[PDB]
Amino acid sequence: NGGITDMLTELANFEKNVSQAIHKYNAYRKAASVIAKYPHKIKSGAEAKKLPGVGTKIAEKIDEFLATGKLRKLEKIRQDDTSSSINFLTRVSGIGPSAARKFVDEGIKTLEDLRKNEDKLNHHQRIGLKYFGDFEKRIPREEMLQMQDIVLNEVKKVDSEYIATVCGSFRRGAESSGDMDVLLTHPSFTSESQPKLLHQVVEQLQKVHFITDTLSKGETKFMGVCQLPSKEKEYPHRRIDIRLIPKDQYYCGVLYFTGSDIFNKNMRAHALEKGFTINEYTIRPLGVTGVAGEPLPVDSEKDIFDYIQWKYREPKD
Template sequence: MPSTIITPLFAFTCAFVNKLVHQEKLKSIDELRSHPKRDQLLNKTQQLGLKYLEEFEQKIPRDEMKQMETILLREITAIDNQLRAEIVGSYRRGATASSDIDVLVTHPTVAKLPSLLHKIVETLTKQFHFVTDTISIGDSKFMGVCQIDTSKLHRRIDIRVFPSEQYYCALLYFTGNDQLNRHMRIVAQEQGYKLNEYSIQKVGSTGTLSKPLPVTSERDIFDYLQMDYKEPHERNM
């Protein structure tokens, strides 16, 4: 079986798939698709993972990512000109191809963020027909499926909203890569800070945390940790 079907994202685990194949005597993905009890065996997220399995396995070329970026930024900022959005992950690090689209969004008014996220998704779904399926949506995160047009493959998309005071910590974290994030958290701990995707805080002698330190750019975080700043394309450790 292709590995995508057992990724954590779609709640498939090796144990689950092996049990399912054994119990139902399945030999292939197509057999699972045509199984009369498929909808009972799989939850909604798993059904979407199965539906788009082969498409999700294909990397997204950078040119297509750029087209998606143009669409997303145009439609998001049209909703509210105070919204700021950026495509993060490997795309921001300059990758020639990406596995999915990760979008970070912020707005200076915190109370507006949940309603704005829902408005963004509604616009991309009903008005622009860019979002084709919703996996889940809450107050701060949307997970779904998108497609530029019917000639293109379906792609996975996540949209997260953050208050402006948390935005640059989130931008750093979700740009990655994972190795750099781990390294920076270790440096932060060694220097008496706690760093995560929400904030950087000073750790007191008793272990108490200070209020989040002011962060107005990614460079501020590097400065707090006395590290040389790395441009996004330099973060592939």
């Protein structure tokens, strides 16, 4: 059902970037994915209506699509110079719905206009403009692996008590990723507790020219650009995030940023039946009254599986 999900995704993107209606966005998105997993060529709006996340208005749009091959509303959207321009601009990192809108109002509409108007771009936006094409590219797995070995080894060289894990679709074993997401921790950093834990690692990664640009950086989160070394033809630049997490919240962190999103959802749901609440930071027990107690000591991803009485599940699954 690629026609229906593409229609929907377009609707989702139009709501997010142009309408600035984040909930309609997520609703269209939820609907698409749900329809992705449906093992039959949808024949009617009503049919899809049965799905969770598919309601009356979408079932109606599905009928119109099936019947006419197109969606009238989507058509008019694409024909509207302002909507399409705003929609395109948001593809630049650091340009969200607010900036895109403001740019199209003053006649700034294209990549070329941005380059002509770099005087009006913040640092994040310039970098986003700069690597516009590379950021939309997928990172094939074998490159992730290469990138991993470098981060882990450079982190190893700074301080070897540093623990680092590359999460995301990658840890679940995907053949490609959109960026690199790295969780870092250290015995000296805890809920209760150093000045430059993240810095030394960010810095050390600049020393060997792996990290090439900085979008943001602070005591706990770094957002930036990296690139693999080449012999021969050069690699695309990639987005990399690095999170510094306290050691007593690291595995909850690892569990969270490993996903999937749908999976986490089921874990939390299950965790409830058993009398535990799980967030990005901690697992805590619930009193009979629904009152969370203190966070429980987690020394591994499995500890969490143990608490909520679940068969430990390997990231791939």
